[PDB]
């Protein structure tokens, strides 16, 4: 989909500050991922050495 | 009276119908029937003691 805003009021019915935290709660979801896959790592037979 | 009665029936109905369609259009509008049914519960609920 796209919006085409620099700063979207409602896009699927959604307000402004719902848009914010949506990203926000995509930051968090890609940092939490990363953060999981990086202690997988540190369990990985790899890093024993 | 009966024919009155005959037609108030037809009537009132197509009445309704605009009426459920117009809710529908607001749910296109606001976005997810999802969304605004949520809506409709938190004013549901601000509306009784809830």
């Known amino acids: 989909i796209i919006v085409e805003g620099d700063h979207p009021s409602g896009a699927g019915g959604f307000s402004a500050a719902l848009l914010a935290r949506g990203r926000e ?3 968090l979801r890609d940092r939490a991922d990363i953060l999981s896959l990086r202690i997988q790592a540190a369990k990985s037979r790899q890093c024993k050495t | 009276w009966a024919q009155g ?4 029936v037809g009537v009132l109905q ?3 119908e605009q009426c459920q369609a117009a809710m529908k259009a607001l749910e296109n509008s606001v976005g997810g029937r999802k969304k605004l049914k949520e809506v409709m519960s938190f004013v549901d609920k601000a ?4």
Do not use: P
């Open chain 1, 25 to 27: 709660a995509v930051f």
């Open chain 2, 14 to 16: 197509a009445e309704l």
């Open chain 2, 47 to 50: 509306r009784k003691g809830e």
């Open chain 2, 5 to 8: 009665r005959e037609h108030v």
